[PDB]
Amino acid sequence: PKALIVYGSTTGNTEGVAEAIAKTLNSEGMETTVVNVADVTAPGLAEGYDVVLLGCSTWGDDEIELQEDFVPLYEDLDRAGLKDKKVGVFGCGDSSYTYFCGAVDVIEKKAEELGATLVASSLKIDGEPDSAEVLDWAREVLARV
Amino acid sequence: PKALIVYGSTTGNTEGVAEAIAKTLNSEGMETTVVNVADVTAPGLAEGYDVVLLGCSTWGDDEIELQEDFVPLYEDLDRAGLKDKKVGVFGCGDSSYTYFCGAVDVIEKKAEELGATLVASSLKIDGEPDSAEVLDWAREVLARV
Ligand SMILES: Cc1cc2nc3c(=O)[nH]c(=O)nc-3n(C[C@H](O)[C@H](O)[C@H](O)COP(=O)(O)O)c2cc1C
Ligand SMILES: Cc1cc2nc3c(=O)[nH]c(=O)nc-3n(C[C@H](O)[C@H](O)[C@H](O)COP(=O)(O)O)c2cc1C
């Protein structure tokens, strides 16, 4: 099977989680392409992948701001081919702020409204990722695809 | 059975939806308590209710914000006794915005992480509330009590 990981990341945190997910998936025979969301467009993006993992950090002062590179994909996510596609959502944040990983909830709800199959409960990284939590999430995705 | 309807509303729209839902529930034999979230504190809020309906509009000048009175309830929602509780989420918004009722997305996701049972898909109200849409949702809730 093939996986796509698309991430929005300002300081590299969510990018590092994407890369760590991909290293496991690739090691377990699921060919995985990791791309900055800034470099993709929505139409047909999920077609041809058996699973798509969406990563996005949360920013904004006293608000949920999606990491800015992700917003155009969120706006047009209805064109990506997610109906009955396996999806998982992840992202970095920090529980000292108001809406801890709120972008992850916003993106996961839209995926669900668009008919995606959510492979696992979302991965919400508080601060610096722990390799155990990232690895177990990658194993859920593998088990479900 | 007893229903709690807790709402955050700045211009009265989600308040008016709360009242319309309550009319339905009360006409179908529930004892409904309606409260503005500005007047409550989180600890133990849900205790003794058969179903809890959480209503909140979407604000924020630039991005997603919960209606301001709801924010402290959301932040301390873990104290509200939602584990194994039947919950429904509703809210007003405007689909001209990027994040249409994004406060509903965020509250719904948190309620499920806290172990609540969602009794119905969440109700997202676009602009002026439609009485048929509200009534259909209230009847979905009543059938799960
Ligand atoms: C001004 C500002 C606002 C933030 N707001 C949030 C927030 O609302 N929720 C959250 O969980 N984390 C919040 N964060 C934490 C960032 O998501 C966190 O630093 C994350 O590691 C960034 O990931 P990235 O490098 O992939 O962009 C905020 C950080 C800053 C500096
Ligand atoms: C400044 C401002 C920001 C808003 N932002 C959003 C938004 O991000 N998403 C949305 O769906 N609706 C948004 N709305 C629409 C309000 O949610 C809508 O007017 C609603 O009826 C208010 O309900 P309330 O009277 O219960 O507070 C915004 C409205 C205003 C005035």
Author numbering:
A (entry chain B), B (entry chain A): 2 to 146
According to the publication:
Flavodoxins (Flds), which are electron-carrier flavoproteins of small molecular mass that contain FMN as the prosthetic group, are found in various microorganisms, and play multiple roles in varied pathways. Flds generally contain one non-covalently bound FMN that acts as an electron-transfer center by switching three redox states, including the hydroquinone, semiquinone and oxidized states. In the present work, we isolated a native functional “short-chain” Fld containing 146 amino acids with the cofactor FMN directly from anaerobically grown D. gigas cells.
We report here the structure of the short-chain Fld from D. gigas at a resolution of 1.3 Å; we study its structural-functional relationship and the prospective binding region for an electron-transferring partner. The results show that the structure of Fld from D. gigas is a dimer containing two FMN molecules with the monomers orientated head to head, which agrees with the solution state. The electrostatic surface of the FMN-binding pocket reveals that the binding site for FMN is hydrophobic with aromatic residues, e.g., Trp60 and Phe101, whereas the binding pocket for the phosphate group is positively charged. The isoalloxazine ring of FMN was stabilized with loops Asp95–Gly103 and Thr59–Asp63, in which Trp60 and Tyr98 located at both sides of the isoalloxazine ring are the most important for providing direct π-π interactions. This comparison showed that two FMN-coordination loops (Thr59–Asp63 and Ser96–Thr99) are not at the same corresponding position in the two monomers, in which Asp63 and Tyr98 exhibit the largest vibration distances ~6.2 and 1.5 Å, respectively. The peptide of Gly61 points to atom N5 of FMN with distances 3.7 and 3.6 Å, respectively, in monomers A and B. However, the structure and character of FMN are easily affected by X-ray radiation damage.
